Amino acid sequence: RDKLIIDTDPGIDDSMTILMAFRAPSVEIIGLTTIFGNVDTKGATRNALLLCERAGCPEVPVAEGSHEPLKGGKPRVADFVHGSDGIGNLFLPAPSAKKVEESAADFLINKVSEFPGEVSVLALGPLTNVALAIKRDPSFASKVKKIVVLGGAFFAAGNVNPAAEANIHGDPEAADIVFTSGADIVVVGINITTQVCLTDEDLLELRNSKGKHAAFLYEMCKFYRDWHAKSDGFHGIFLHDPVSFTAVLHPEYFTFKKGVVRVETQGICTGHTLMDQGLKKWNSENPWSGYKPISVAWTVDVPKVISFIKKLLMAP
């Protein structure tokens, strides 16, 4: 039983991940921390609370995080990807369960300090709360067991624009703080997650399954699948956040390369993630020199990942 905190912006695929995580027996969800991205932070908290109620676990703490990136300013949210409500325009009634008093940053510091080296963090949105925890407690990185990050585009196109992936673009300063923190980090970029999909056929199979949340998941995914058809020209959905959850439980379904990762924080390439694989000896020092390397997902065993995700989504 691995202790896990999910830092998230639910979010359609975040919602699928959270419901999958509640059904996983080898995982103990000790809390959900929320962030902006797919929806404003208040909307993410509302969804996280609704998901806890839906999974039959309203006692699981939900800690609201930052309303804006580290640099400040009202974030632009992906309402064209996840709907006005962040869950595909289902416009569900409000939760009865309430968030905890403490911020997501304080919740992360407290839980990780309570069980040092035992709590893993699965980061499914912009990395603001994680960076805030790193800055407020400089021992946070060393106490966290592992940080599995869904974010970045390594030697591949971004999904916000050609340079940047959404989570990194949401807070490039926070991502750069996290990637250079010295913590045990595993980054799963969209160069990996775009290889893992659910087709229209797979979604119909989910709708017709005996899955506990099959009907709700299918309904939510309609809006998400429609964005994929309009933007990527793909008839189905990419499984971004469910793949990073698979990397927590089954890292053996992937291969990783170690390297220093830096994030561009200004100019036309704001939010671009770049890894130094260390295969070339540089003549002089550069921005990738001297930092501790992190693990970057390089390859994925697509059938094994799909099988694992499908069995959790279709579990009665």
Residues that bind a copy of itself (CB under 8 A): 80, 155-157, 159, 161-163, 230-233, 262, 264-269, 272, 274-277, 279-283, 286-288
The smaller minimum CB distance to Ca ion, of residues 69 and 125, is found at 125
Q: State in angstroms the smallest separation of the CB of 87 from Ca ion.
A: 12
Q: Give Cβ neighbours of residue 117 (< 8 Å, ≥ 6 apart).
A: 143, 145
User: CB 41 → a copy of itself: shortest distance, Å?
Assistant: 21
**Residue 296: half-sphere exposure toward Cβ, Cα within 13 Å:** 24
Angle between helices 240-249 and 12-23 (to 10 degrees): 30
Instruction: Please give the Cα distance from 214 to 217 (Å, whole number).
Output: 5
Sign of CA dihedral 10, 14, 16, 20: negative
Name residues whose C-beta falls within 8 Å of residue 312's C-beta, 6 or more positions apart in sequence: 20, 23, 24
115 contact choice in Ca ion, a copy of itself, none (CB below 5 to 8 Å, kind-dependent): none
Annotated binding site: 9, 14, 124, 241
Interface residues with Ca ion (CB under 5 A) are: 9, 11, 14, 124-125, 241
- Minimal distance in Å, beta carbon 296 to a copy of itself? 12
Burial class (CB in 10 A: 0-12, 13-18, 19+), 71: exposed
Q: Which does 11 bind (CB under 5 to 8 A by kind): a copy of itself, Ca ion, none?
A: Ca ion
> Cβ of residue 307: shortest distance to Ca ion, in angstroms?
22
Choice between 9 and 176, CB closer to Ca ion: 9
Per the annotation, the verdict on 240 as an active-site residue is: yes
Q: Choosing among Ca ion, a copy of itself, none, which partner's interface includes residue 195 (Cβ < 5 to 8 Å by kind)?
A: none
Three-class SS of residue 33?
Answer: strand
Nearest approach, Cβ of residue 129 and Ca ion (Å): 13
Q: Based on CB atoms, which residue is closest to a copy of itself, 80 or 115? A: 80
Instruction: Closer to a copy of itself by CB, 5 or 39: give it.
Output: 39
3 state DSSP class of 240: helix
Tokens 């017709």 -> residue: 208
Q: Which of 82, 169, 213, 240 is catalytic?
A: 240
Nearest CB to Ca ion, comparing residues 14 and 171: 14
Residue 14, contacted partner among Ca ion, a copy of itself, none, CB below 5-8 A by kind: Ca ion
Binding-site entries for Ca(2+): 9, 14, 124, 241
Q: How many CA atoms lie within 13 A of 147 on its CB side?
A: 31
Q: How many residues does the chain have?
A: 316
Catalytic residues: 240
